[PDB]
């Protein structure tokens, strides 16, 4: 039986846009039916990287198993429950993508994160994360205490060190900042390493590539 995205996009679904709650958990599918220009995509403005490439990978996947790889309850020194936005409403209330966490400073301090996850799930693991390019210097300090920040991600086959690009863009959904999102496939027994001192949109949930075979996007 097919997966009928409605007005939700592949990006909206995999990131977990609160407008896409129909797809919080999705049974096995034959193929995926997506619209041309879906209404519910990146609720917080930005870009989804290697999007076309991910979509191609999806043409070979028949089911995901959503696992929690970093408990939200495990951010001891960062505030993980108030990274929400009126760009991402849930029942007309400020929210955010369900699968990732917009970490903010706690007690006026944002300690350097040195987190790591080893793939012990026996299957290829799809992991998404992001970086927030904030509006201006003020907002940068309002959210993270540090004006000079970076995102650092690496696996055996990935080396990323990104810096937030601060400048005020035209508003999309109320927001003048942007977010870049990224994804990787973490092979069994490999590790992914996360490091940041601000602007990091962290993984909470990730997807095991559990079923394969012939699918397609339509």
């Amino acid at each position, epitope marked *: 039986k097919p997966l009928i995205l409605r007005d939700c996009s592949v990006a909206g679904w995999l990131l977990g846009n609160p407008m896409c709650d129909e797809f919080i*958990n999705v049974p096995e599918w034959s193929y995926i039916v997506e619209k041309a220009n879906p209404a519910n995509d990146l609720c917080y403005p930005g870009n989804f990287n290697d999007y076309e490439e991910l979509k191609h990978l999806l043409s070979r996947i028949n089911h995901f*198993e959503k696992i*929690q*790889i970093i408990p939200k309850s495990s951010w001891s020194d960062h505030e993980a429950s108030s990274g929400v936005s009126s760009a991402c409403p849930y029942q007309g209330t400020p929210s955010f993508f369900r699968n990732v966490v917009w970490l903010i400073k706690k007690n006026n301090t944002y300690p350097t994160i040195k987190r790591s996850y080893n793939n*012990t799930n*026996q299957e290829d693991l799809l992991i998404l994360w992001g970086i927030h390019h904030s509006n201006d210097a003020a907002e940068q300090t309002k959210l993270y205490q540090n004006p000079t920040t970076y995102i650092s991600v690496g696996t055996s086959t990935l080396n990323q060190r990104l810096v937030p690009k601060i400048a005020t863009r035209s508003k999309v959904n109320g927001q003048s900042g942007r977010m870049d999102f990224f994804w990787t496939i973490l092979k069994p027994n490999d590790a992914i390493n996360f490091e940041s001192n601000g602007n990091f949109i962290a993984p909470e949930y990730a997807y095991k590539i*559990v079923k394969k075979g012939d699918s397609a996007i339509v």
Partner: antibody
Framework: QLQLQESGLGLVKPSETLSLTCTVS??????????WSWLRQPPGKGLEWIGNMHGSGHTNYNPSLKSRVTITPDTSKNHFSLRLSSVTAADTAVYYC?????????????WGQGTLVTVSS | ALTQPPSVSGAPGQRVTIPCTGG?????????VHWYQQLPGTAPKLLIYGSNSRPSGVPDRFSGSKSGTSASLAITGLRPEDEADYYC????????????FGAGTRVTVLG
């Protein structure tokens, strides 16, 4: 502290509708970061899953019960409810409520205390 | 359905394992296996989820693995307080899917 409590009738006539509520304190039945779930434990000790409910109104029920189960929220009282129709002796059990992570093998993190329900006539 | 033995036993300090075997549409399909502990008078409690991921308050001594159609809860350093019923859970992809559970295994401590 998040605490959960089941409550409702202890004795239900067969073919009637079993109805239970879970009262939640220390977190709202909003938002959407969790599943709000019912499970049960028949004599013949087995655990049995009844369904998950998401605050958005989307649900996933046990296919053996889908046609009879209903799980709905009451945000203005921090309750959610199980409503099981056409019960028989087969539905006699200890019922649990739970708050769950959004994992596809769902992670029943926090459980209620349990409430016995005897369907008897 | 997943199948557990009704009881296992061991002596304090040694190791016991509870097998959980299912089929191609649950455990064999690659889905995680969760574990719950139920003390005699009380509700169940989450013990292990995902791939051997323990909630806070769960000791190192509790460990889960998985191979093919079967999963295994290992309890090392057996203590009398481990005496409880343990239930395994997984996902089964039949018919829009279902959470699926074992019938529970009673751990008896022998010394």
């Amino acid at each position: 502290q998040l605490q959960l409590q089941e409550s409702g009738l202890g004795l239900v006539k067969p073919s009637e509708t079993l109805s239970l509520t879970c009262t939640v304190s220390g977190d709202s039945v909003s938002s959407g970061s969790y599943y709000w779930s019912w499970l049960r434990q028949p004599p013949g000790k087995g655990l049995e899953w009844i369904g998950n409910m998401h605050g958005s109104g989307h649900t996933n029920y046990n296919p053996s019960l889908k046609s009879r189960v209903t799980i709905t929220p009451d945000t203005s009282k921090n309750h959610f409810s199980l409503r099981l129709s056409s019960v028989t002796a087969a539905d006699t059990a200890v019922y649990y409520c739970a708050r769950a992570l959004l994992t596809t093998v769902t992670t029943f993190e926090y459980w209620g205390q349990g409430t016995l329900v005897t369907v008897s006539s | 359905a997943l199948t557990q033995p009704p009881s296992v036993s061991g002596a304090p300090g040694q190791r016991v394992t509870i097998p959980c075997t299912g089929g191609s549409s649950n455990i064999g399909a690659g889905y995680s296996v969760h574990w719950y502990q139920q003390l005699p008078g009380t509700a169940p409690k989450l013990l292990i989820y995902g791939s051997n991921s323990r909630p806070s308050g769960v000791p190192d001594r509790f460990s889960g693995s998985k191979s093919g159609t079967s999963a295994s809860l290992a309890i090392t350093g057996l203590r009398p307080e481990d005496e409880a019923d343990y239930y395994c859970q997984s996902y089964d992809s039949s018919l829009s899917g279902s959470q699926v559970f074992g019938a529970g295994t009673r751990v008896t401590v022998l010394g």
